[PDB]
Design a protein around this ligand. Sequence first.
Ligand SMILES: Nc1ncnc2c1ncn2[C@@H]1O[C@H](CO)[C@@H](O)[C@H]1O
Length: 298
Amino acid sequence: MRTYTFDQVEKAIEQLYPDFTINTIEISGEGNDCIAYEINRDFIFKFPKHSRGSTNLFNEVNILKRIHNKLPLPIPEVVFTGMPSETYQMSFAGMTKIKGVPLTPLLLNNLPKQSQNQAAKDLARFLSELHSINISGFKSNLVLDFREKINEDNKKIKKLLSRELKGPQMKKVDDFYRDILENEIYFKYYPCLIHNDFSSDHILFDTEKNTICGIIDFGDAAISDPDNDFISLMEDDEEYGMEFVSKILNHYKHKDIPTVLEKYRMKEKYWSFEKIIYGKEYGYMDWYEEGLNEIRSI
Ligand SMILES: Nc1ncnc2c1ncn2[C@@H]1O[C@H](CO)[C@@H](O)[C@H]1O
C-alpha cells in the first residue's frame, strides 16, 4: 500500500489543473480503497492506496457521472479526474464536498421521532430511485451476479486455504457453500444498481435542519441484489437495527421482508469467508487470520 504527502497530492493536481489554486489541504479520512483529502473546504479528492483501490475509484467516478442529478438526496459530483498509469486506472478524483456528519445510530436515536421518521422515508426514497436506475449501459465489471460471486469465492477459498485446513474443516466449508448454493432465495433477485456500502458512515446528516444531506462513497456500487442496501443497515451493534430499518422497508414498499432477514443471517455467517478473501485481496493480514481462526473453530 501507498500513502501520499501533501506536496504529492498538490503536484498531481497541479499537473492536470494548473489554474486551480489550492489554499487548504487536509486528510478528511481513509477507506480501504483511498485516502481522502479535503481541498479548499470545497472538494474531496480521493487518492488510491493501491491498484485494486484505483479500479474502485474509476468505477466510483463512472457511477457518479451516470447517476448525476437523478436521485433525491445530494451526492458527490465529479469535478476533477486523474489519469491512468501502469499502476492505477485513475490516479485521483476530486468530487464536491457534501457537508454534514455521519448519521450514527447514536445520533439517530437522539433525534425527535419526527426527524427519525423523516430520515427513514428519505432513505427509502433514495434507495427506491437508486434501484430504479437503468442498468443497460453497465458492463460486466459492474455486474455482480451473486451466484457467480459465491462460486468464485468458493474457488478462491479453496485455492487460498487448501494447505491451511484439515479434512473435516474443508468439509465444513464445502457443506456451507453447498447449502448457500441450494437456497434459491439468494439468487432470484432483479439485478439493479445498488450502493453496496450502504451504512451509517456513508449517510451524511445536517444537524441544523435535522435532515439527511448526502450519500457518499460509491466505490462498491454494482449491479446486484437491492436487498444488499437494507442488510448493510441492519447490523445490530455498528448499525441501525431492525425497528428503524423496517420503517425504510415499508416506506420503500418492500414486498418480502422475511427474505431480507434471511439474506442478513446468511451474510452474517458469510463474513468469515469474506474476511479471508478480502484479507489477501486488499492486504489486510489481520482479517485473514481472524477469518481463518473462525473457520478453524466455527
Ligand atoms: N464527497 C464527499 N463529501 C464529504 N465527505 C466525503 C466525500 N467523499 C468522501 N468523503 C469522506 O472521506 C471518507 C473516506 O472515503 C468518507 O467516508 C467521508 O467522510
